Design a protein around this ligand. Structure first.
Ligand SMILES: O=C(O)[C@@H](O)[C@@H](O)[C@H](O)[C@H](O)CO
Ligand SMILES: [Mn+2]
Ligand SMILES: [Mn+2]
Lengths: 349, 349
């Protein structure tokens, strides 16, 4: 049965938005966060991880996803030395497994985690948001590694590098107790001369096939994949569900076609994704994991300076998904849960 | 078959801007009222346009006038009523001369609402309005004029008397409302039982039935505030909601979540498993019965440093409700065979 834990990303002590605040989003169960005091490829110690946990539980919550142990460019290049970095990932995994966290989320995106033309792009309703102006500055160098990718590393070269990678980490992930969740390349296509392999359905099916385990899975970022219209999320979500290989939902909305993409409000009809259908699937498949609103719009006074990661609209997403999940569960002859235990503190009957 | 997603606005003085109100996903209509005429007087169209001009420029549309206050001299049956009904006449007529289809209101002695506590702590760390019966036992409620108005209702105004004065007032203003467009929507009393020796008569199913019948006509209806009525456990809001949908008698939906008992009542997150109301059912009914009016997530908790000192009118949890309802509607619409719809026109500028 669907134990779908609603979640929020939180960057720790240094976040604009606080734990207490997140706590006040009704239905909110999980925290999604990362150890930030240790260089990429370098290995997370148990104590950085136990210090996040200690805090998160202190504010009546639990870390459901560790979002991103950063995958070092050397591994992404497949340079001779990677085994060194790779082992640090194993210690990271292990120690996550040692803090009682079920799911680590990563990406094998060379150089560019995301590409964003406009951080302040207007929208019909008056909000600004993130968009991908396919024309604007794009198709031009963003002023060593890049030319290595540009020149030698092919998609299949990157594929094999990735095969290498996860073939080395999994038996570890399996003994730690941690399911791996690859986050699609964002945008779901190669640009800037660099390769992006993790592009859609066939990519997932080769990916999933690299190591055949529930521990080896995807973070179904339905908004990322979908921002190239060539790929189709419902059947993509559906497929992974079918095979039992989603260990993390991101669930944000974005609008697109052959012109490029813009991020928008979460609500099904402010963009190309029918979000109802996405979750209705999570219902029918009794799916079990954490979904985050993930990215919002800047609305109201949101002084959150960092890009798409302010509290307000993200929280708006979340109760919208609460409403979606609430609904379909009953509609399914089921009873949805949000981890709520007390209604009151100090009356009841 | 479409419910318009609405939100209440206290006029020019509202610390919550229309831009912020416009910022909510799927938000459409505006719920507001005049503030510059003393009480039982006229409402010049000019005052209502001076507020409608401010609004449709900002993207929004008056879908209800939330409250022209019926004078006490009216409810009290005092002789001087006819003139103060003559000025409630104009109000009624002038409003329907500005496209606005619905006017909400109440017939409640002495106070529009009561609460023992304007900041009661909830389990998720936030604070919401509450009526704790016991904390308000040891209270004796112009000022002398109050000590006078209260004394009258206590001694010489029975329940039947208050029904009396409601009918006289109702068969007065109903023609005024039908010759204007305006559909009339009564707010149940809050709490939906008598307190401080004072009578209430808009309390439950039994009473809704008598009300409708006072004047059998579609522009003679109610505001279905599931929250007010569910503060009393003996009430069954699901059946109440259905009953009135059948008679075409719901002219506006408030949609607020409470928890309750013999102890009294506390307000909570709009989400169902936080309080005592199965919200999904209530919107489901709204979808089974092709309901055409507008719904307002009512009151919200005091979340996220929100510095609004007004009952439950802050922006955030009021807005978090909105989007929860956005989810529940849509989600249900698609299980029915219906296509939802919000304020959505152009996904992108
Ligand atoms: O039933 C109630 O008390 C609510 O509908 C409030 O909207 C009320 O009318 C006041 O405006 C809240 O202070
Ligand atoms: Mn994402
Ligand atoms: Mn109300």
């Amino acid at each position: 049965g669907s134990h779908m834990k609603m979640s929020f990303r939180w960057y720790g002590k240094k976040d604009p938005v606080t734990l207490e605040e997140i706590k006040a989003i009704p239905g909110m169960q999980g925290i999604v966060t990362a150890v930030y005091d240790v260089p990429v490829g370098q290995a997370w110690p148990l104590e950085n991880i136990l210090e996040l946990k200690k805090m998160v539980e202190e504010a009546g919550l639990e870390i459901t996803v560790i979002e991103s142990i950063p995958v070092h460019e050397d591994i992404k290049q497949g340079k001779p030395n990677r085994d060194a970095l790779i082992e640090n990932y194993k210690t990271s995994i292990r120690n996550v497994g040692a803090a009682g966290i079920p799911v680590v989320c990563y990406n094998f995106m060379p150089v560019f985690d995301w590409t964003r033309s406009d951080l302040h792009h207007p929208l019909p309703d008056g909000s600004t948001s993130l968009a991908f102006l396919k024309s604007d500055l794009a198709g031009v160098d963003p002023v060593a590694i890049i030319e290595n990718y540009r020149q030698n590393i092919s998609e299949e070269d990157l594929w094999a590098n990735l095969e290498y990678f996860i073939k080395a980490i999994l038996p570890t992930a399996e003994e730690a107790g941690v399911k791996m969740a690859i986050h699609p390349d964002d945008p779901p296509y190669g640009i800037f001369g660099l390769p992006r392999i993790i592009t859609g359905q066939e990519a997932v099916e080769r990916f999933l096939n690299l190591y055949d385990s529930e521990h080896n899975g995807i973070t179904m970022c339905v908004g990322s994949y979908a921002s190239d219209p060539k790929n189709d999320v419902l059947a993509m979500t559906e497929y992974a569900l079918k095979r039992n290989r989603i260990n993390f939902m991101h669930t944000r909305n974005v609008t697109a076609g052959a012109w490029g993409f813009q991020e928008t409000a979460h609500l099904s009809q402010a963009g190309d994704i029918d979000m109802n259908a996405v979750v209705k699937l999570l219902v029918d498949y009794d799916w079990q994991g954490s979904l985050r609103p993930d990215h919002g719009r800047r609305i109201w006074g949101d002084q959150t300076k960092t890009p798409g990661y302010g509290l307000y609209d993200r929280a708006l997403g979340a109760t919208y998904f609460n409403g979606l999940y609430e609904a379909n569960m009953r509609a399914a002859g089921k009873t949805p849960d949000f981890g709520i235990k007390a209604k009151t503190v100090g009356t009841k009957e």
